[model samples]
Target chain A: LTLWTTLDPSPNCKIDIEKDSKLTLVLTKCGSQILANVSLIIVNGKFKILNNKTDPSLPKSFNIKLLFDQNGVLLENSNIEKQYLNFRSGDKNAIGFMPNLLAYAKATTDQSKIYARNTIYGNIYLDNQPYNPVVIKITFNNEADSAYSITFNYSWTKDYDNIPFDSTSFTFSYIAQE
Target chain B: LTLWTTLDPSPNCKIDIEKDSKLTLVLTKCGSQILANVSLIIVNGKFKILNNKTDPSLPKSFNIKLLFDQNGVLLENSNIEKQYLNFRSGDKNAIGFMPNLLAYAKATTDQSKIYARNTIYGNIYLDNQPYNPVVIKITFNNEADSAYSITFNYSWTKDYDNIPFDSTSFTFSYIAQE
Candidate 1:
């Protein structure tokens, strides 16, 4: 579940993603296993929000961004790569991946890690364990209805420890937006 | 200074880039001095095609791709990122950066190196000195009059020499498309 407050990088701006938008080859991981399943489809169109922890309020008014760290996935069924990504952090920021984040569960016993780029670096750690990754980030938008150009980035790091987990960076999302 | 017989990713079709398209922060790099200047604007609307060594005919057809490795620079005066890129190899494989290519000069008396990404790794070499770079690639398009979805990629390598100079992957461009 996700909730948004000060959304939009440009106020009511049409973000890079929308309903039925497809991002492919996003990794699926779990404890002791990186890809716990065959990497497949993740959707941007299917979502809802919480008004006050219990009542469901799905609002599509403010601009929201889908942020994540994706690697090694080609655009599904084709060689073309994927564009745009989504993520979430702790609730104190904006909400999982947000600046004033909130509302999610974190493992207190077991451990895992995830890393992100740009405005922030989400190097998530639990019980002191880490997951290393080299990711590719792509950007796109919806206008007269299709994707365009073909731009991307290759983000990496050598000092994994220096990039620590914070309420500022942790618990990324595939569905929740901010 | 670029030419292409095989343009477009699909059949003699409309490509992702054309006249007046804007891809920002495409790095402007040079010799031992690196940036050597203020990184400013680069464009895709300005181009012409060279046929056979002696003829000049500007072509506005086929799907041509702009490939390169860009770094540090942001999207113009804004904090947003840039998309797409361009490159060229030697004349033997693909004129400047093509297969079955021709007509160009090599620095037999000087030294420099340029690297590229994707379909090939253009670790261009001349007398063996190399330039180091970490780049970000963004993709965009022009259909009704603007670019969309701000997407990108980050490409890097540790063993720069092992990725030797190949007619397979040489010079990259901020303008020339493949």
Candidate 2:
């Protein structure tokens, strides 16, 4: 569970997630010109969601989810459900993801291909061991001028991916306000 | 400068180096069997060592040095200090070093090739920019059974390579106490 930039001043990017963690962008706080190549990687090491801000019950079938004020998407494409990602044997679970992502990097970002209710529904393994992630990559997109009150309701679950491994991340670096 | 591992419980390996910083392994505190592939990477971004603990003045000519309990050695195998090591243009000097070490890795680990003072001399570049490293890889090796009162005296220089990047590190994992 870490968040680091491909840049300097690389603070400990581990999410300050409670039941969940929320960061709001106000006024000019949200830079229009987003930093390039900046990636926020989530190394899902905690699972077993017994108590979360959202559904206290275990997720029937939901892995990693990313939601925006105006949009959201699923990370678990069908291509990932079967294949072992960045799998390696080490001190802790070491799954080599760079090579795995390369296989799926060719997908087109067409508007019609988007889905709102998305989910990477499956058990993720880090060296044959299951360590699924159950959380929301929740973000807000309050327009710079129009004060459209935009907010997200994200309540995470009891994390248990403490030992296993899961790989999902946000690597795009740009801002295109519509 | 960063220190990490091929293992877990990974910490910020950046040296608490002041003019130089010292971390002493006392009593039975030092872990016996050294773990494998644990690496401390030195991304030499700083240059111009105007003030150091030992050589307060500019080093007549010395780069990265590694000293030991009853030994020492130089990282400058001539294989380095020249051909750019892991030089990548990114957010902050992205100098890849793993490749350079590979070329040198083939060399035999012979007894005679070992030197008392290991120094990786000369300016190392990240994207054609000079970023030299001037510090001591000081360590103490007190044997377990035998109470050998061994010690080290290392004083570092003022850090200047805070920007340009250098590529040298310690990535071996083992122990052979004789």
Candidate 3:
């Protein structure tokens, strides 16, 4: 998952996870005028979730919740959901620019929109079939003053693992607006 | 000027302002929770200024002031200064990346640092003398929730035109931050 302005599109925007990794989603500007940082868990081959600041059991399937401080209180909007990936054949080595990918994907928020193209590269084999190493590109257009969150789910399923391609999800939230 | 985080270096983080252009700096996240957008007046061969939303008066070397609403009140910080440039000799056909020129000048802020290399390639003639097309680049690193301002000045005085390189000052303020 990633977030960035259309004005300048470098930096990959949000956290780019080649594999699963743990990260602290730090939002210097939250709902309040202060900063807030939350721990996030990206379990490899599983789902990404907020730690709830405590070890909570998995919910089988749940939306990614981004936290914000509202008048010294914490709040979350659970709208962005995870999407799984199904491998698509293409020239994996030559994925065009982010804008091009965004246009191809027809990505959009409730009010705004952008596009991205997904290319399944990397030959991670499974049962003599190519699977894994799927790349989905996205661009977030944050044009509001308040904190906003958006979710998406995508995955790769070329080998037909039969392991329901559900649960693979990610999110993009603007801690503050620019 | 802008900043972004990326796993792989591409063209997604920094703002690219081409020659002879006017850019408006907008920062959704300011010192406070409100959004702000300021017009950046870039008059070629002169200084760039924030066209004081109301009155049109130029302050004497004023710092770049980014705004925010402090508990329903507005505020500004004057720290980032405007820098100037003088287009030097060259085909000017193309200029390399900003980071490269940034490194050549050892550009940095109070907290973060990244280095780039500078290579003068283009050349122009002044009074029949060869003068290399010079380009110096830099950006203020605003990471913390707090609004930031920075200033830098540089040049390539190969063949002085005796035309004082004044009035070329410019500034970069986040009209909005996301």
Candidate 4:
């Protein structure tokens, strides 16, 4: 069974693990913004939940709750389930998403959008086998303001109607708010 | 004096400079987005605006309105009022916006912000030579229900505040929308 955990950066932050070999989630600080960092680290023979502030048990539903504040919040790899390497067919060199992906873009205003491309990259065929179909998923909610009305926008390069043959380089850009 | 004109698609969209050699703000529609087969072109300093569609008149005001329905709205350089080349003294490249850039960025539903370093390139520069700017501005709006949104996010490497003496290759990525 896969263990689940939530690490919300509020009040005080701490890390505690009962086993030497378990999954770990690191909780860090970001200046004046709400952020939830969750990761699955393999230890010994088991996965342990480490460095978490929120209760280890929370509803893993696909609904976005209130954000930390106006700067917008980021839920970094908050996957509570589905952790482990299956048959292994991705890049031999790629070590998943590490320090490279800084933060997930979220909108704080009605027309807030990042100038950069929101990327989701992972190898698909390494040893010549089919990789996982569902790579990653995210949920968003509306946090409106009085001054301006809110609106949400969605964009993608390849869609269910038009899937790409190569997953090596896929990029998409958009702006969302409200 | 500078002269500027707009061309509609199809039946219209043609211009005659009368061999004046130079007359600014001469805009023409090349083709319509739906009419992909036919495209307009400029030959011998004249226009064959295709399809009777396309707005090439840069609005007189620095801050012009934007719409997804509008085909092509010229915002600046119709008669470039100012170029930045002359401002920095001896800087060969041209700069300065044909219209008020800051105001335009602030006045729209676009994702308008500046991030990292955005560098301007091959600009015609403003040398107090007393003519409109050299660059032209154009935009394309996304249709409703599509994964497209108006964008206005820009930044540059040329430290406008902190001049860093570094070999900077010009780079920029900003979709102007409002």
What is the TM-score of each predicted model, taking all chains together?
0.18, 0.20, 0.23, 0.18
Segments in model 4 whose C-alpha atoms lie over 4 Å from true places: A1-67, A73-129, A142-171, A176-178, B1-178
- Listed for each candidate, the true contacts retained, as a fraction, are 0.00, 0.00, 0.00, 0.00
Better of 3 and 4 by DockQ: 4
Compared with the true structure, what per-residue lDDT tens digits does model 2 show for residues B1-178? Answer: 1111111112222232322211111111013322211112222212222233343343323322221212211123211222122211222221211111222222234443423222222111221111233233322222122111112222233344332222221112223232
- Please report how far candidate 1 places residue A22 from its true position, in Å: 1.7
Chain A (alone) TM-scores for all candidate structures: 0.17, 0.24, 0.25, 0.21
DockQ for every prediction shown: 0.01, 0.01, 0.01, 0.03
Candidate 4 per-residue lDDT over residues B54-77, each given as its tens digit? 333312111111222122332232
Model 1 TM: 0.18
- Candidate 1 per-residue C-alpha lDDT over A1-178 given as tens digits, one digit per residue, 9 for 90 to 100: 1122111111121223333222121222222211200011112222211122232343322222333222222233222323333221322222222221122222223353222321222221211122322233332221111211112222334233322111001112132223
- Docking class of predicted structure 1: incorrect
List candidate 3 stretches off by more than 4 Å: A1-23, A28-147, A150-175, B1-102, B105-178
lDDT of candidate 3 over B9-55, digit per residue (tens): 12211112223222222222333122222222233322322222332
- TM-score per model for chain B alone? 0.17, 0.24, 0.24, 0.19
Q: Going through the candidates in order, what is the number of backbone clashes in each?
A: 68, 36, 45, 31
